[PDB]
Amino acid sequence: AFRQALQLAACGLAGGSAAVLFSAVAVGKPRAGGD
Description:
Elements: H1 5-12, H2 17-27
């Protein structure tokens, strides 16, 4: 049941949750508490 959970997970990380951090790092250095 965790076989499909691995393929559906990368789907959102292929251009969604990586954007929020992408710009956050492009504007400055991320830190534990602010990012």
